[PDB]
Amino acid sequence: PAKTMEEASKRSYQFWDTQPVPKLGEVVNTHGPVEPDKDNIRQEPYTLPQGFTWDALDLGDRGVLKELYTLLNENYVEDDDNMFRFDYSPEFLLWALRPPGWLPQWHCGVRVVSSRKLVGFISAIPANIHIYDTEKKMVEINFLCVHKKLRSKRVAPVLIREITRRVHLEGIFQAVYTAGVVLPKPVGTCRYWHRSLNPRKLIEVKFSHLSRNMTMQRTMKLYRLPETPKTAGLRPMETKDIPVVHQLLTRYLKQFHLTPVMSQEEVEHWFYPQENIIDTFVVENANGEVTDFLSFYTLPSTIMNHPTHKSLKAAYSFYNVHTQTPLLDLMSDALVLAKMKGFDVFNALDLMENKTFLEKLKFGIGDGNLQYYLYNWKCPSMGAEKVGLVLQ
């Protein structure tokens, strides 16, 4: 894999060259599908290597959900240095994988025939996506994972072709996804920034480093936060707020070029607070009107090979909508709330308007990139500030 465009220029893409995506070299000046919709779809699953079998995972079965939890906990995305690994909780996986419209055949597992061990996974969820001047029903692809012992045997192309086939059967021909690797061809390139909330732990586990010109005591003062948020009328989102949160989000997202189009039921699913999964706080003003909201989701990482610290508690910026409260003040309060809730670090991308507050709120730039991709859709690339889509 290539994590920089430089390394990707020298690479050859034996699988992705076969797929309806633009080539890494060319510039795109068109808008539309790479190839027309297929009107006959392969009925049979693609063939796996001998000894492995497809199994659709019923995540409503607690035992099967735990198997998926364990596959990802042991084999999912690590940082560049193999020090941290995502640790999606079972309840988070239910949130991410059973939104409105979820389908069981889109929870696509691979098992060893003899032992029944779960060794592979890929998922699709439906989403309406606004890309420039087009709204398209698409899927979001997530949680592609191959067991470490199965790596480099080209199982991932089979997983991708099989989820593609299963999505084609439902009449959907475009997809959106992110990756830390460079593939043909990014529609936008984003970067994670990190806001330290627990500097001592972050430095101990080498998530962050102590600046050579700074001492620990000074570093802890640099990152100290108020005990309580400052914005008048900030409170957790409630059921009665679902319509106005939907309204605020829909109007706020029109300014970006890659965004979700959420129904009111989807807004309920993605924003209604669930402890240790998703937090949403609204600003209810002196007239009783909701004018702003902030949100962040919970995604810890395993700290590998460490005798004392085992997990890094991380909050991820989700969607933050401002119409009367300054975005800077909203995000300051998100930091205070995350600190109150025990998070070690607050993460945010440089997309939407986030660059307006990242440096001011003492975020530090992270390593690597988060590339955004469309499958079977040709359009010009865009700057990070025009990406208005956040995936789990």
Partner: peptide, 8 residues
């Protein structure tokens, strides 16, 4: 499909 980032 996320990327695991830490501080540069």
């Amino acid at each position: 499909g996320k990327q695991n980032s830490k501080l540069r």
